[model samples]
Target: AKTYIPWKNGKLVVSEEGRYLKHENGVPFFWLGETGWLMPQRLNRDEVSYYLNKCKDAGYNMVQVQVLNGVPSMNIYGQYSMTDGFNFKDINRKGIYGYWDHMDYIIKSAASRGIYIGMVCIWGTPVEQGLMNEKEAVAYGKFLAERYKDEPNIIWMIGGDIRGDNKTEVWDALANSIRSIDKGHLMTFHPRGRTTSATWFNDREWLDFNMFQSGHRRYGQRNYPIEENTEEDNWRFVEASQAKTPLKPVIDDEPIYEDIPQGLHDPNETRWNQHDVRRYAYWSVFAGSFGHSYGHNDIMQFIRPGYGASFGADGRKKAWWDALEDPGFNQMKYLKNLMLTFPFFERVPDQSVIAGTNGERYDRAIATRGNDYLLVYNYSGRPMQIDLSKISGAKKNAWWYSAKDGKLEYIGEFDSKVTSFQHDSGYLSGNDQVLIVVDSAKDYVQKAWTALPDAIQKWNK
Candidate 1:
């Protein structure tokens, strides 16, 4: 028997149906990712090791980082990414780790821990401000692609936090240049807040998947002028991308961060907690996202005590290292584990599994089903009437899975029909629960299992 480890599984590819991701040899690849957006800028070699080790222990197989925040990006070693604007001929130094060399260390370090690094080539602000042009994009992309072409754990992310149409020519040049040089890794665009890569680059031959920044807006926040009423509904982005032609796997790369203000600017506003992140993760995945990326206010910036808070962090006093164990950060792995415990590629987001009218906003209960199993995520733990007959089962085994912790409680067997159930906590805003209903004949999960395995246990026989 051959055991499958994520980083060791081989090059990643979108599944044949374009709905999910799997390894080259056919093992399912669940993108359990964390946002360390400023790791390259703030953290040193030792700190990078610590951060990546924590990510690995938390079961994250992917880490999204901002490779260059500015035209001449500065790392902790006092080395700049570019010696001259967009020119890397003199970038490397012999004795010390240069900006790009430090980046190389981070990428290799993550790979050693079985984590793939999603590189945001350059932050969007520079490009939006006319710092990079078409010619410069081509040169930078060529340098990046050639340097990391042999690295198996690198995923190219173009247009960092910028609208794909902002600098259309430059983005195309960057993506095309990279694709021309490096044919090994996958590539996609990291769109502006509240937007998806499908919005502009959906049909791009170089884009392998779609990524959306569902953004940090609360209900009724009108900061970004998008006419979709589902302000806090990140799942809607997943749905929007899935409907696009030549289907590409989509993921919510930047949802509202944990411990950040709800609307993202007001320091006086309420901060999003672990429960909020749980809702985002479940809703989007149930809506057919291939994977989900988790972010945190402190973690993303690697904020410390002396450092000035970027997005209003005066209310809390935790550093990036301290926030690593935040409930939301640790709980994301449960979603990944639950997904892999059943059939992977055949799954589809089918809301008809809900027997009655679904609740709106935070009360919403989203559903997804495969051939023999169905999963319904009830964020508020409201009593849900599920149509068990939706899956192929005469009798169904139900379980109440805790979103706060990766704990499971079997709910015995029931006839395959509409049945009402609620969590032990009843209807409450923060009491999230996932109702896992499976065909009685299937043994995807055992009654004796209290928690999911930290590592995905796939064996090739």
Candidate 2:
């Protein structure tokens, strides 16, 4: 038991300040996750070894998966999610032994690789299929919480893309039921497009954190009634949530998926490429989110060209194994490492550092300032200047962080009062790059500075 450690010596707990999450020992835990909505039913038993290991190697510590997906959720070997006719109440029952066994194995297997399972109990559409009932909802929560209470690597994710605007009571019953049995793990909800769980459960005792689906909609096609713009404006959801009471960690649990059609419904339009995914990741985290999640079209469905999924595949489909090597999958680890190696819990989003007066950053640049560290995401290489006077200590050390490969190249140091700063290179592609400016006196700079060399050495092996 003692030997199983990567980012944890014990269970994960939300920080005492309630602004972020940390390991029980108080080491800050950066929740870097990727979504595999159909993960349980999509991947086979033989693939477990590769699935978790690949995630671990790529520095992903969490995988969001649905335990009981809606519509059709059949495993590779023709196994349904439950034994008793697709009902939520029948899970873990005697006849459903195999289903439970498979889930247990995946959870434990993920834990073995230091990856926690963001277990979604039931996806939303099942609500019409008797899950809308009050007692059954609580019973579903109770069943899962009791079973997984002893397991360390678990985080309960409720409300799978469900519209819960008028159904707060139903959602409450489910979450409260889980809390009644197991307060050991942190809990949050995964609402549908452009909406946050806070709209339903803000300051609620049952919900330990907040998540929003700023989903894969196109730039101008904002679907949710709350927000006016599309997925690129998703950080507005986090910005609004962090402005509320009893501060809890928030994340963009879903965003524009890599290699998918824009707006999700328009296959004729251009696909949401790696650049859009990178922009979303950087934007969300800088909007005061404690973490963020990435998704891909093929991996989420675990699609193989001929294998049938809810989303049909002909030329677009690729094996889930091949999808693992996508651009978004590999690049997000850089964000995770940079956040954790710095003073994350003490960090706060500050737009004043952008050294601009009459212009809008929108999605162009976002900044976060810590006690002695500052991360400015230059979404465009648009010469957005920095005000170094806002930074602390004797001098500021800067690095151009390539979000693509997670590499850092030093940009030398300057006096703290050096008010204006700008850069040209370090772009991963067309124009986006990150300026990691740190206080020379802080311990975090050295650690973050060495991250690239360490990653390089590890990659060679």
Candidate 3:
């Protein structure tokens, strides 16, 4: 119920007496989490708890819940529906829908497991729809703020994606309303696809973080330019927003939905296979994103059946849900643990570094934790060789690990004696990348430095 900690000195810093969450060193903690829209609505208490447990077991510390999904005729208002047949009042009379009560239990359950919940306001609801005008918006905002303002595990996200000719008025009213009521918690906007929240709320007083959606055109088509997936699109937003505001943390609020069709061109695009999810995630984090929100088409379908079941613009049914557990939720857990094992807060994207000779623009690279390591990704399907000489003061002893497998592998010593090493050469073809863990300049001479006993202790402890 409390507000989120602010970002200070490039990290999430805690405040309000542990009511807010922060990084290990008081930096604004950037979480790598998932989004489950239909969770509360579709799944029962047991089912919801089980799924959340599965997510936590997979290494996720955060979850975003769509308290409200678009309903027929009601537009978007509150977290759930207020319409007749599907209205909360009617649903509650049947003793079937508890709405906020259900959410209260779910959020409390998640908090018990050390997972934080990002409670969303109504999805795209506005005054025009008879939901709430500016004054009512402020009243509702205060009601919500006072209701859960003291909860230690909640982060408030105001407004869903609102668009159209009069979008500006709705957006302004929404933002002002939320801020008027809840100045205690951090706030951010979730704009519609292809747009950046920064455009309107970047400078708003209540805004704490910035969010963007890199929605694809169809179900599963690359959505982004072939060279760059939606991840890159999000990165572009983050890069631009940071330059403009320089104070707020940036995140990809809605990237590609997990287990959804890749898009039209190929019917096979139905499922965003496990590999696709991992690649998308790593690409964003490696490119300097604060965090990512993961979603699954099936889960969305389950929440709002009619929406996902029908043929999307790409002319595809919601069939991807059938292939759910191949790599399952566990994959995310392994990835999160691996990334946290390092000094992630210190990581920064270094575009100056190149990944290969072909000069593919999307073959981006980044350095982390004071240049102790470098992460290089080859977004292209073809494998390419990268020259380590491009990095200044290359360390002699360098190690590598697979963010995919969480296995640490040894790359031969990078001594001055050898000019360069060919990595993933033919082995990494098609959307694969390698992470190079470089030893400090002092560790260059001692190849033994590849194994850090301290890191092992930190990771284990």
Candidate 4:
């Protein structure tokens, strides 16, 4: 494997089309992610290696975690991740030694595995728990920039689930410090639910990409707060970023987590399964996102099965290890694989293929067309009244791609010249199939479904 590509611009930038993320050399980078909120605190050295290797094998390129997951006693050393417990006076090496050192190890190890860590400095603590001041924030920011300046396999995540409206000064200082220090890596903020980094940092040169938290609570119900709905034309958070001047790559960094509560914290309430999570991933991408971020309730906290009380857990039951086998987690790779099959830069969400989504979040058919092929995803198997003339050619070859197991079967030739005839709801995007309509002239065929991830295969055995 190549260690460093000096010729390959280390800087991660949007492709020329402004559709997806890529290296300076123009290699497409898919942001297939899994949540590891408390990973730094929960896992030991051996365990961290084990988890990262599994993710690497499962086709994840990025792992998200907070630099300081909890109070001073969270890690094995019982030391605060920061120097002054929130002051961030040069990364706290004066008295304690291992917390930050271990973090360095984690970063390097992830790089060795060909995965980037989405490291977050401060979570929502500054606003909620009163942990930060400006001078300390700047010092901490500079310290981080200098410390990780050499580490190329990192995507800097500034704030963790934070509201962009509040704590503006400190967040700005932190972002500016990193921007001034490390120019090689990419940076973006992880906003709280119903808001996006663009809502706050769209104008800043420091914010490299835009991210939004479509959130779990609202998706099961497909509802949003009144104020958020005020931008009726821009309901989902990503468009607000896309609408801005310097069009940055947009992604739903946080979505409906698997096995999380549906209607909020009620344990009895219906939980979100793989279907709901899949919808968010597809909708966000098919709508216009460059990529998708997948999360799980149990995996995020790294909760042990019979371990300590899982604080802030809504209705989590399985341990982190067991939750790793959750279908949603493994199933995410399918989207990445399918994206690779299509022509990059040419594929995009084409609403012109149809009239509208009717303003409802769920059950709305999502359609995207590339230069030679078109894919329409109907989540509920709803009948789509497609406009035939909108298609590139009158004659087309149709195929059914089962999103469940990566199975692609020939559906038969269809004449777009004729007015009607689409693949069935059951055969396509109903329980979840992707109807792929491609030009008959092209030698078009997607690869077959491969084996499952090692962890999942073992679990099934």
Per-candidate clashes come to 0, 1, 24, 2
lDDT of 1 by residue, 1-461 (tens): 13234746678999998999988888899898899999999999999999999998887889999998988889888888887899878778788678888999999899888889999998899899999999999999989998999999989999888888798999999999999999889999999888999988889999999999886988877855366567789988988888999899999999989989987888888889888898899989999999899999999999987788978874248889899978899999889889989899999999899988778888788999999999999988767889999999789998888888888899889998899987878577576888888898999988777776643755422
Q: How many angstroms is residue 50 displaced in model 3 relative to the true structure, after the best TM-score fit?
A: 0.7
In angstroms, how far off is 256's CA in candidate 4? Answer: 0.8
Candidates sorted by lDDT, best first: 1, 2, 4, 3
Tally clashing residue pairs in candidate 3: 24
Cα lDDT, all candidates: 0.88, 0.75, 0.54, 0.71
Candidate 2 stretches greater than 4 Å from native: 1-8, 71-73, 85-97, 128-132, 308-317, 358-363, 426-431, 446-461
Task: Report model 1's TM-score to 2 decimal places.
Answer: 0.96
Candidate 3 achieves a global lDDT of: 0.54
Q: If scored against the real structure, what TM-score would every candidate get?
A: 0.96, 0.90, 0.74, 0.86
Clashing pairs in 4: 83-92, 429-433
Ranking by TM-score: 1, 2, 4, 3
Instruction: Please give me the total number of clashing residue pairs in predicted model 4.
Output: 2
Error of 4 at 278 (Å): 0.6
- RMSD, candidate 1, Å: 1.9
- Writing each residue's lDDT as its tens digit, candidate 3 over 131-221 gives 5555545545655666566655667776665542335555566567666766555667777766667767777776777777764343233
Model 1: CA > 4 A from native: 1-5, 223-225, 314-316, 459-461
Where does candidate 4 stray beyond 4 Å?
1-10, 70-73, 83-97, 219-235, 306-317, 355-361, 388-394, 418-430, 444-461
